[PDB]
Amino acid sequence: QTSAVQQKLAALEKSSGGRLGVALIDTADNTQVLYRGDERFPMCSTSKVMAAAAVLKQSETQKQLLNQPVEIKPADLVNYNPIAEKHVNGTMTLAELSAAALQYSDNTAMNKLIAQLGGPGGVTAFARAIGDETFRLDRTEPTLNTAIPGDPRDTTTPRAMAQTLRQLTLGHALGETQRAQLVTWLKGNTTGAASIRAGLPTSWTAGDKTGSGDYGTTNDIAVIWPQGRAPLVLVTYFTQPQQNAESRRDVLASAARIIAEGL
Numbered sequence: 001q002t003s004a005v006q007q008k009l010a011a012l013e014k015s016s017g018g019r020l021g022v023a024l025i026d027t028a029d030n031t032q033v034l035y036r037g038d039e040r041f042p043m044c045s046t047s048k049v050m051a052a053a054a055v056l057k058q059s060e061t062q063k064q065l066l067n068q069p070v071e072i073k074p075a076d077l078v079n080y081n082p083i084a085e086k087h088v089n090g091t092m093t094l095a096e097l098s099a100a101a102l103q104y105s106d107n108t109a110m111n112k113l114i115a116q117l118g119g120p121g122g123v124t125a126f127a128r129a130i131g132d133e134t135f136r137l138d139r140t141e142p143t144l145n146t147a148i149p150g151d152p153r154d155t156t157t158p159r160a161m162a163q164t165l166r167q168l169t170l171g172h173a174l175g176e177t178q179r180a181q182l183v184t185w186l187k188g189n190t191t192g193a194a195s196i197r198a199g200l201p202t203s204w205t206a207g208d209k210t211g212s213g214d215y216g217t218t219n220d221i222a223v224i225w226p227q228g229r230a231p232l233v234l235v236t237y238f239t240q241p242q243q244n245a246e247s248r249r250d251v252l253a254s255a256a257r258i259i260a261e262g263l
Ligand SMILES: *[B]([O])([O])[C][N]C(=O)C1=C(O[C][C])[C]=[C]C2=C1[C]=[C][C]=[C]2
Pocket: 044, 045, 046, 079, 080, 105, 107, 142, 143, 145, 146, 210, 211, 212, 213, 214
């Protein structure tokens, strides 16, 4: 069946010229709204949530892990490292790397999280351990953002990512302290105001992680606390046919606005 909301998302997609994927979980009743919910999309930096969560899980049995120093060398810098560059020839703790990766989308920080987990497959392994059979991380930064159409590397589906974000931020995939820490990091994100958040009523609060890559890939995954109702989990993925396409955060805001108006 096709709902009014799905029809509106299709119209938005048609006018955008790209491919849009949406997955909403409304925890007020556990219902879901999906648009291309089972198609694969390149995650780009939204994958950093899985990596930070995997490290949080390891910290449940190692009380001092988050305070563990990790060396940052000149050779570790990649294409975007706003936080890590300040620490070259120095160190960053795993908590500092997680916060930098999540709140500023630092790529060097993400690579340190991936390394701590034993490589991209370590992130995938954690996803499997928490019930996500779809997610796959195959490469490090910055190549995991190539976002080539048809390429299965570093992809997931909106349905799977929404389910996983719910389990991580509202459920019990992580211990209570770690869940709280992940939510605190997401709510402190600095990069999301033009994405999902721009399509929501101003009174609502939320935590999110954005993603950007080639083929104008523009992503955002969010946990949302609407005014007067149970939380929502929303994933909005968008990718375009040309490698050098421009970013379209407004399309994500438009998708979020349609979802909100459909409540
Ligand atoms: B994540 O998606 O925020 C990290 N993204 C990238 O490193 C990246 C961007 O985003 C600027 C931070 C734009 C275009 C790219 C990127 C990586 C590889 C190819 C193209």
